[PDB]
Amino acid sequence: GPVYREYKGFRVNDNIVADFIGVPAVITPGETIEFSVFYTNRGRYAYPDTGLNLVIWFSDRDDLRREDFKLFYKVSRADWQEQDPAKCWDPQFPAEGGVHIACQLSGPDGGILSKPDGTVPLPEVESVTAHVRLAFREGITSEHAGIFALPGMLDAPGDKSIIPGLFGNVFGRLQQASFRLGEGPSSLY
Amino acid sequence: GPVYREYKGFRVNDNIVADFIGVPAVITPGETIEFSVFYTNRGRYAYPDTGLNLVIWFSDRDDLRREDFKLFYKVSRADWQEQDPAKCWDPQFPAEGGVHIACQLSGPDGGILSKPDGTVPLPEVESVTAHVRLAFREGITSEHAGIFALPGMLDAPGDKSIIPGLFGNVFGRLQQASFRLGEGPSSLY
Amino acid sequence: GPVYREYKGFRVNDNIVADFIGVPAVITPGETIEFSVFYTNRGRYAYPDTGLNLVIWFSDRDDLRREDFKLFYKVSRADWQEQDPAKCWDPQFPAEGGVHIACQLSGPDGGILSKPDGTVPLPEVESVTAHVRLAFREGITSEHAGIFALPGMLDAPGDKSIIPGLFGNVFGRLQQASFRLGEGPSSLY
Ligand SMILES: C/C=C(\C)C(=O)C[C@H]1C[C@H](O)[C@@H](C)CCCC/C=C(\C)[C@H]2C=C[C@H]3C[C@@H](C)C[C@@H](C)[C@H]3[C@@H]2C(=O)C2=C(O)CN1C2=O
Ligand SMILES: [Cl-]
Ligand SMILES: [Cl-]
Ligand SMILES: [Cl-]
Ligand SMILES: [Cl-]
Ligand SMILES: [Cl-]
Ligand SMILES: [Cl-]
Ligand SMILES: [Cl-]
Numbered sequence: 263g264p265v266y267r268e269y270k271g272f273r274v275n276d277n278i279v280a281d282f283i284g285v286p287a288v289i290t291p292g293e294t295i296e297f298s299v300f301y302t303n304r305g306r307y308a309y310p311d312t313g314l315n316l317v318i319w320f321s322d323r324d325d326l327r328r329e330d331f332k333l334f335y336k337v338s339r340a341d342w343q344e345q346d347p348a349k350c351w352d353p354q355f356p357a358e359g360g361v362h363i364a365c366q367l368s369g370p371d372g373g374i375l376s377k378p379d380g381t382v383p384l385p386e387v388e389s390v391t392a393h394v395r396l397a398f399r400e401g402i403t404s405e406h407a408g409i410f411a412l413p414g415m416l417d418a419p420g421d422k423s424i425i426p427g428l429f430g431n432v433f434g435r436l437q438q439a440s441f442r443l444g445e446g447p448s449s450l451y
Numbered sequence: 452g453p454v455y456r457e458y459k460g461f462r463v464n465d466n467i468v469a470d471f472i473g474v475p476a477v478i479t480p481g482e483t484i485e486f487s488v489f490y491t492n493r494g495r496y497a498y499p500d501t502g503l504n505l506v507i508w509f510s511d512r513d514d515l516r517r518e519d520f521k522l523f524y525k526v527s528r529a530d531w532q533e534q535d536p537a538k539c540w541d542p543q544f545p546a547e548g549g550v551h552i553a554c555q556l557s558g559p560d561g562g563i564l565s566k567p568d569g570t571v572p573l574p575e576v577e578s579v580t581a582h583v584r585l586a587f588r589e590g591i592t593s594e595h596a597g598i599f600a601l602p603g604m605l606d607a608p609g610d611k612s613i614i615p616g617l618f619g620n621v622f623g624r625l626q627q628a629s630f631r632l633g634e635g636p637s638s639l640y
Numbered sequence: 641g642p643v644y645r646e647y648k649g650f651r652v653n654d655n656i657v658a659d660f661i662g663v664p665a666v667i668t669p670g671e672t673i674e675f676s677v678f679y680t681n682r683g684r685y686a687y688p689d690t691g692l693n694l695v696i697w698f699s700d701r702d703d704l705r706r707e708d709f710k711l712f713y714k715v716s717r718a719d720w721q722e723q724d725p726a727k728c729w730d731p732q733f734p735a736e737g738g739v740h741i742a743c744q745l746s747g748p749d750g751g752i753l754s755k756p757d758g759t760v761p762l763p764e765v766e767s768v769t770a771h772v773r774l775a776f777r778e779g780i781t782s783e784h785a786g787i788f789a790l791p792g793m794l795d796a797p798g799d800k801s802i803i804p805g806l807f808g809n810v811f812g813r814l815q816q817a818s819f820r821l822g823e824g825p826s827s828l829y
Contacts, residue, residue, distance in 0.1 A: 300627055393595070437659075441661065451775055580786075
């Protein structure tokens with residue numbers, strides 16, 4: 263099996279990366295956007311079970327909670343579902359301010375990689391995609407915010423997830439999308 | 452020489468990577484989008500000739516053919532051209548479902564890296580871009596699809612392409628862009 | 641210290657990478673766009689001072705100057721500012737043709753990573769983002785162009801930037817976004 267690196271108290275395999283497609287740099291409050299995000303096994307070790315976690319982060323206010331946004335997703339060709347508030351970590355508060363809400367977006371991928379027992383194994387070069395629909399409620403803004411993709415994997419089958427609400431005991435390479443929640447640019451000319 | 456990995460029977464140099472810009476996460480049937488894709492030599496071995504391949508994949512149906520979409524491209528500062536249906540691979544039907552249509556988008560880049568003999572050598576840190584205009588015919592949809600970038604290179608000068616229709620005898624790191632072909636998100640609010 | 645590669649006479653740590661979000665593949669002359677770009681320490685060596693450099697490149701004309709566009713940005717949670725032309729490199733003219741304008745987008749990041757003395761250290765896994773507003777004046781176009789992200793860092797505390805107008809004495813991994821400046825695609829159908 264692969265060897266992990268230490269970030270905080272967690273193990274991280276950089277061979278499991280993630281990519282965003284279609285995240286806008288400015289999101290209008292109240293408006294619904296759809297984007298896709300996918301994690302890909304760039305290593306050679308096939309993980310027996312995998313799922314995506316998504317973290318919503320505002321750097322310049324700490325009142326954001328899970329309830330302030332709507333979140334739906336679909337794992338590859340499986341059906342759409344509403345992201346489960348109980349499958350989230352509790353709000354986390356960096357010492358410099360802000361807040362982030364970690365949301366689990368795991369599940370079978372429609373029988374592409376997923377297996378009849380419910381596991382989503384990740385062989386080399388393979389990938390799992392989440393199509394995501396996201397909307398923040400009106401009246402909430404942020405001037406420096408991000409979505410973060412955090413691949414969760416189970417090192418070995420019988421291992422169990424380490425953070426309550428999120429999938430996995432080891433994690434992949436964090437990928438970022440920075441955005442603003444508010445109004446788009448005035449014309450510079 | 453450079454190091455290859457064996458996937459299927461093919462040699463793959465991961466140092467030749469690809470990036471997408473401007474791929475939407477939802478594509479409207481009948482509508483034309485333009486995006487860009489470029490492959491970059493992140494390694495140190497200079498390849499004597501290179502060209503881009505693009506793969507369109509539907510995970511949830513196997514009736515897609517080259518004819519069901521229109522595809523134009525332009526290599527860096529060269530002129531626009533229509534992609535050649537004869538420079539495509541035949542339909543492929545993965546066991547994990549669907550069909551994919553592999554398309555060659557090769558050619559001189561307008562004299563940036565390209566040479567008078569038509570070759571596009573790829574030195575370290577250098578990159579080649581295809582600007583791509585894509586439209587699917589009205590009336591065809593997909594709920595989980597991808598565009599894939601597959602950089603093709605000729606290991607040795609005068610080597611011959613190994614997959615009929617596609618450029619290259621060895622290949623780079625596959626890059627994915629997941630999307631849906633259909634209607635956009637309804638308002639969550 | 642970390643390990644560098646030599647590109648021209650400059651030292652490059654490929655471990656400091658950059659990502660774009662929201663760069664359109666086609667930019668309309670005169671119009672203002674907002675995108676975000678961020679650089680991340682994918683290595684283990686914490687850099688004592690870092691700042692983003694942004695290169696605007698036209699491959700097919702050499703008359704582009706800094707005066708031909710308007711450029712505003714904000715480092716993470718800090719406020720917007722107009723990019724300083726005196727904090728740009730002189731126009732550079734590749735031997736194959738074209739021109740590129742290297743612009744410094746440095747500054748405190750709003751107290752996230754930045755320190756009271758003004759430096760923006762970059763620990764492992766941490767990141768700095770620029771939100772960018774860009775507009776080209778009407779009447780200049782380009783059919784093959786790019787934005788390039790070049791993380792600039794200070795190897796040792798108190799080091800001096802090496803290229804005039806740009807931040808850093810060593811640099812990170814160049815990241816590209818290819819686009820056209822002109823009219824969007826006509827309908828292919
Ligand atoms: C991911 C895309 C990649 C990896 C590239 O493709 C970059 C390559 C090729 C470019 O596309 C240029 C045709 C066009 C140049 C595009 C970007 C140009 C620079 C960032 C330019 C300014 C800052 C300096 C960075 C240090 C580290 C090297 C020096 C010389 C200089 C650099 C430059 O002068 C470049 C070059 O002379 C050639 N180069 C440069 O970055
Ligand atoms: Cl990643
Ligand atoms: Cl790649
Ligand atoms: Cl690339
Ligand atoms: Cl990737
Ligand atoms: Cl990079
Ligand atoms: Cl010139
Ligand atoms: Cl054009």
